[PDB]
């Protein structure tokens, strides 16, 4: 949950993030696959 607002602009979060004074793009959650593996074809977004 990297904020696109001032101050708290980062954090691999675990709940709802409260940046009041943050826009719609003023936050940005990235739903990352930290649970199971995928057969790493480069047509899938691999380990960058």
């Amino acid at each position, epitope marked *: 949950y990297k*904020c*696109n*607002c*001032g101050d708290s602009n980062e954090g691999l979060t675990t709940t709802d993030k409260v*940046i*009041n*004074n*943050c*826009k*719609v*793009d*003023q936050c940005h959650a990235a739903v990352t696959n930290h649970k199971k593996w995928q057969y790493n074809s480069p047509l899938v977004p691999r380990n960058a």
Partner: antibody
């Protein structure tokens, strides 16, 4: 708190255009979540959109874009909900709604706009 | 459109718990649905007595509560007075704005 310094009486003609400004305090214009809003003559708050702080500028409603034009004087700590080029039946108040304090947590001061030259 | 069969009617005495028990034309808005019973004041003064659907809003009297009441918008404004003439608007928060309804402008006993 996030409170818009409201517009003046935008007395334009039918087709005349004037801004209902919302000098957004609580943040900057790039820090104050202005919801554009037309406090309509009949019903009340007809939304010109919501815009959270880090942008600030209210992204428009369903019918809330068009004649009411959302813009942001972000370095001037405000937006402009411009009652622009409207017909005669759009005399309404230009207001903001402070998108922090989970609804519009403050209100813009409003401005009475009327189409008559 | 976020205008249900709202709390449009409130005529009470000073200190009365002003209940905008608005029967929602769609249903109960949530805390993420942001069913806030704000005070849209006279002279177009948008303010929150209860905002975000489970929290009392800032800048209002302390007895305000904006939530779900009935099956719709529920304003429990504790301490509603005669000088408290304003609009109990129990409305929603769409997650991209807060949408105040028609509301009920009221004056009280006092």
């Amino acid at each position: 708190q996030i409170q818009l310094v409201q517009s003046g009486r935008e007395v334009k003609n039918p087709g005349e255009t004037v801004k209902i400004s919302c000098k957004a305090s609580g943040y900057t214009f790039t820090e104050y979540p202005m919801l554009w809003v037309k406090q309509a003559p009949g019903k009340g708050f007809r939304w010109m959109g919501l815009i959270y702080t880090n942008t600030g500028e209210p992204t428009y409603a369903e019918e809330f874009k068009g004649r009411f034009v959302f813009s942001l004087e972000i370095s001037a700590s405000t937006a402009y909900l411009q009652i622009n080029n409207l017909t005669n039946e759009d005399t309404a108040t230009y207001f903001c709604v402070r998108d922090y304090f989970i609804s519009l947590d403050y209100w813009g001061q409003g401005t009475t706009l009327t189409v008559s030259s | 459109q976020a205008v249900v069969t709202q709390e449009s009617a409130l005529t009470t005495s000073p200190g009365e718990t002003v209940t905008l028990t608005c029967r929602s034309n769609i249903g109960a808005v949530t805390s993420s649905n942001c069913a806030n019973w704000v005070q849209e004041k006279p002279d177009h003064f948008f303010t929150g007595l209860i905002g975000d659907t489970n929290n009392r809003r800032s800048g209002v009297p302390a007895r305000f509560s904006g939530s779900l009441i009935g099956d719709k918008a529920a304003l429990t404004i504790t301490g509603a007075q005669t000088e408290d003439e304003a609009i109990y608007f129990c409305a929603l928060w769409y997650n991209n704005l807060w949408v105040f309804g028609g509301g009920t402008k009221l004056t009280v006993l006092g």
